[PDB]
Amino acid sequence: YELSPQLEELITKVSKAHQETFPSLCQLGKYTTNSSADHRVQLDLGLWDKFSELATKCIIKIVEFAKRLPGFTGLSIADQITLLKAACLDILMLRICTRYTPEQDTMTFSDGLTLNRTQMHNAGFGPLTDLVFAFAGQLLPLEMDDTETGLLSAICLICGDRMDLEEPEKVDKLQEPLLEALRLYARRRRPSQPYMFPRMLMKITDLRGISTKGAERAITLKMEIPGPMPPLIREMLE
Numbered sequence: 001y002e003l004s005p006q007l008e009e010l011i012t013k014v015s016k017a018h019q020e021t022f023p024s025l026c027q028l029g030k031y032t033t034n035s036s037a038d039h040r041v042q043l044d045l046g047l048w049d050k051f052s053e054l055a056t057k058c059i060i061k062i063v064e065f066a067k068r069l070p071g072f073t074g075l076s077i078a079d080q081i082t083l084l085k086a087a088c089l090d091i092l093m094l095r096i097c098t099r100y101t102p103e104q105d106t107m108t109f110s111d112g113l114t115l116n117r118t119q120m121h122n123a124g125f126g127p128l129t130d131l132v133f134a135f136a137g138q139l140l141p142l143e144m145d146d147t148e149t150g151l152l153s154a155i156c157l158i159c160g161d162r163m164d165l166e167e168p169e170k171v172d173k174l175q176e177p178l179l180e181a182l183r184l185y186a187r188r189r190r191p192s193q194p195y196m197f198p199r200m201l202m203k204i205t206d207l208r209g210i211s212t213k214g215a216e217r218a219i220t221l222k223m224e225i226p227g228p229m230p231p232l233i234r235e236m237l238e
């Protein structure tokens with residue numbers, strides 16, 4: 001016993017918020033491009049234009065997802081912004097990792113655009129490509145479903161340990177039921193895999209590491225593009 005209708009409602013609210021701001025790989029009509037498909041180059045300007053537009057669109061969806069999380073809009077507008085700026089890269093990574101097709105070694109974006117590893121390199125990832133693909137491959141054995149990805153994204157976002165929070169205690173209190181919800185959900189879905197909940201939480205460390213490497217890549221990439229990065233990407237990286 002000790003089940004809670006409030007905790008069940010939180011699981012569904014978070015899963016739906018994620019699913020409604022992020023299509024599943026199976027619901028997308030994949031399409032390709034022949035742009036710099038067979039050889040790595042410093043930067044393909046055509047691919048960067050399409051990729052950075054897809055990144056802007058996903059940052060907007062991440063903000064929509066956040067505003068749907070119970071209690072998020074109850075935090076001060078400064079803390080809402082602080083939390084989004086701090087976790088957006090972590091969430092973009094979790095999201096693109098669910099869009100990895102190992103057989104074809106491709107990533108699929110929300111309009112269905114499917115890029116191979118060389119194309120992901122040429123679109124802007126550059127020296128970060130292989131690490132991102134390695135991260136996606138190591139997330140695959142966890143076999144997380146949409147609810148679990150949604151809950152883990154909400155846990156990364158609602159984090160009281162981010163710098164410059166006005167009400168970190170309030171953020172910590174809001175994160176507590178998200179952790180309870182993920183543990184309850186994960187254990188009930190796969191009771192024969194009790195290590196799944198701590199494996200998901202331990203992934204946050206490598207997710208932060210790959211986000212730090214993302215920020216490092218934005219520095220060098222800036223020197224390669226002809227103009228400034230899209231404004232919402234700049235909001236994320238400041």
Ligand SMILES: O=C(O)c1ccc2cc(-c3ccc(O)c([C@]45C[C@H]6C[C@H](C[C@H](C6)C4)C5)c3)ccc2c1
Nearest residue numbers: 054055058092093095096109110124125214217218
């Ligand atoms: O359509 C989608 O469903 C979708 C999902 C996940 C995404 C994830 C990224 C995404 C994920 C991790 C990243 O490190 C980045 C970058 C960080 C900085 C340095 C590079 C150029 C840009 C600045 C973007 C790489 C973008 C980009 C676009 C994405 C689009």
